Design a binder for this molecule. Structure first.
Ligand SMILES: [Zn+2]
Lengths: 300, 156, 176
């Protein structure tokens, strides 16, 4: 465990919100809220092209199989259906009335969910884009949408710790999960099997929650997450690894069985908004907000 | 522009006739004000009774710890007072009526008919409420998301 | 005569018809006495007669502008000490003091109150339980009782006390 700095991805006008790697080692664009998506690289920061022309800042952008097809979850209550080599507004998604926080293409590449805050969540079509359903996704605003390994389950996060695994074919979720905290959950996600969900309970104790029982496996220590948005990552390249984001200008990389403090990596100048992981190689990015305006690549 | 970069900072008998049809009255339907609400697969007529506010009776003082309970799991945002003596909870175990919302044109009011087991919050009608109209009550103690005609866009 | 009060009650509380005994209500609401002082070292007695298994009842001095419905120890007006696991309370927070009281004792309470020319001590079978806190506020100091299921405790104000200690110079409240 000697993960060393390799590159630096600067050149931002506003704060960077997210990094999300390509599924097979292709790209990592500037998924920020700066009205800019510059197609940066994952291996060496290879600048490809400029895809911009937005009205407001993008909360997060989606991703595709070829890491090209996008849809903008911007803050102007609209969504364009994007392509890299087009630069053209195909259609417009309408049905929100607040911040479009999050949107996803499923791993089968045939759905466009779009998360909202006043529960105007609509699951859209990739081809047509017709108004289908308002969803009562929580009692609270949504802070995560995700699709599992195959694409029949939708996890969603709340401001009181609702791990609702929404069904794709029917629309009725199965199991309600809870903690004794009152957690404003910034992010939940699936696993490579869909059974363990890492929520956000904000007293420096983030828990990996089971599918059926709703218990936790191993409650980690030594991390800093009480107010700010921090993603949730795992690594399958070599052995067991735990990678997350930080707040105190560090890079959080640990192991699952230990629950210790064995590696933290200085090098940032802001609260780490985002880290991410790569399946075959230990190529790890680490993004931060406006007081850094860089995305620093890491590699063993 | 980002919210992610910003940190998160005669009456009794007809009433029991209504008591014998609680599955038959409504089903748990939605409302696009916020999440759910309550619609009907029927036309609720004039002087038709609907629901009773039941659940877990708080004593005189236990609300002063229930307000601390509201800071753990954010449990009850569904309040309605019984009286000066007591309050009724509907969050741990009790009445499932915790999805009756409010728009600033409420189509129901609160009325009290008293049994031997104490004062009970009783709902009736005064008009023929049609199919699918959301039942919602005036509060009289966060802005609304309804889009109503001549709407105050508040709670009370 | 040093006795109880009329409207110092909740309707679920039953001040008994002897004005020497309070009957417990199964919840937790505060009943208080009627004759108190403001400055000086004074004394009375609560004779705890009978107790069920696994109870919770808190006794101590109080001021009348507190909560009429609280378990005792909820406010800064008053202190308390619980019959189970022996805990002193400041706004009803668990701060471990001793082990609580049982069946067949007298809980006769001492007060200390200086002034420019203040602590609350609890007794139990004459045992000096120690000091709860120091430098309490200004007001009229009533006793206060909140109980379990309908048990039996007695109050006492006469100079023929059951357990008179010999460690402090105190006065009975019946001199009023
Ligand atoms: Zn309205």
């Amino acid at each position: 465990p000697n993960y060393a700095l390799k590159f630096t991805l600067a050149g931002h006008t506003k704060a960077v919100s997210s990094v999300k790697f390509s599924p097979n080692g292709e790209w990592l664009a500037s998924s920020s809220a700066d009205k800019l998506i510059k197609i940066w690289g994952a291996y060496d920061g290879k600048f490809e092209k400029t895809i911009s022309g937005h009205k407001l800042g993008i909360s997060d952008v989606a991703w595709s199989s070829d890491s090209n097809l996008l849809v903008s979850a911007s803050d102007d209550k609209t969504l364009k259906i994007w392509d890299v080599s087009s630069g053209k507004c195909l259609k417009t998604l309408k049905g929100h009335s607040n911040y479009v926080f999050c949107c996803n293409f499923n791993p089968q590449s045939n759905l466009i969910v779009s998360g909202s805050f006043d529960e105007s969540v609509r699951i859209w079509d990739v081809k047509t884009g017709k108004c289908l359903k308002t969803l009562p996704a929580h009692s609270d605003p949504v802070s995560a949408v995700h699709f599992n390994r195959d694409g029949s389950l939708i996890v969603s996060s709340s401001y009181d710790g609702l791990c609702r695994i929404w069904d794709t074919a029917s629309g009725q979720c199965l199991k309600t999960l809870i903690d004794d905290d009152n957690p404003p959950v910034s992010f939940v996600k699936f696993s490579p099997n869909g059974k363990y969900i890492l929520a956000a309970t904000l007293d420096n104790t983030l828990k990996l929650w089971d599918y059926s029982k709703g218990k936790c496996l191993k409650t980690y220590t030594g991390h800093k997450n009480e107010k700010y948005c921090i993603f949730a990552n795992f690594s399958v390249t070599g052995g067991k690894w735990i990678v997350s984001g930080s707040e105190d200008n560090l890079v959080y990389i640990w192991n699952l069985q230990t629950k210790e403090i064995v590696q933290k990596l200085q090098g940032h100048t802001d609260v780490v908004i985002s880290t991410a992981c790569h399946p075959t190689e230990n190529i790890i990015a680490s993004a931060a907000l406006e007081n850094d305006k860089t995305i620093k690549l890491w590699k063993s | 522009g980002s919210a992610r970069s910003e940190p998160k900072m005669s009456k009794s008998s007809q009433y029991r006739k209504m008591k014998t049809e609680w599955k038959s009255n409504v089903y748990l339907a939605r409302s696009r004000i916020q999440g759910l609400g309550l619609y009907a697969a029927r036309d609720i007529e004039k002087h038709t009774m609907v629901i009773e506010y039941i659940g877990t009776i708080i004593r005189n003082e236990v609300a002063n710890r229930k307000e601390k309970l509201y800071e753990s799991q954010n449990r009850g945002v569904y309040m309605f007072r019984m009286d000066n003596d007591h309050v009724i909870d509907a969050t741990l175990t009790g009445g499932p009526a915790r999805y009756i919302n409010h728009s600033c044109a409420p189509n129901c009011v609160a009325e009290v008919v008293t049994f031997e087991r104490g004062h009970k919050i009783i709902i009736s009608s005064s008009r023929r409420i049609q199919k699918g109209e959301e039942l919602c009550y005036d509060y009289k103690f966060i802005p609304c998301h309804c889009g109503a005609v001549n709407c105050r866009k508040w709670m009370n | 005569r040093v006795l109880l009060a009329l409207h110092d009650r909740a309707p679920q509380l039953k001040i008994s018809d002897d004005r020497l005994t309070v009957v417990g209500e199964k919840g937790y609401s505060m009943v208080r006495a009627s004759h108190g002082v403001r400055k000086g070292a004074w004394y009375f007695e609560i004779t705890v007669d009978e107790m069920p298994p696994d109870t919770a009842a808190r006794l101590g001095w109080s001021q009348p502008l507190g909560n009429l419905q609280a378990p005792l120890g909820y406010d800064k007006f008053s202190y308390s000490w619980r019959s189970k696991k022996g805990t002193k309370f400041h706004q009803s927070i668990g701060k471990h003091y001793s082990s609580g009281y049982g069946q067949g004792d007298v809980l006769g309470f001492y007060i200390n109150l200086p002034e420019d020319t203040s602590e609350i001590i609890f007794y139990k079978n004459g045992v000096n339980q120690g000091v709860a806190y120091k430098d309490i506020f200004e007001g009229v100091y009533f006793p206060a009782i909140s109980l379990y299921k309908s048990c039996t405790v007695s109050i006492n104000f006469g100079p023929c006390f059951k357990y008179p200690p010999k460690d402090l110079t105190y006065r009975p409240m019946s001199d009023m």
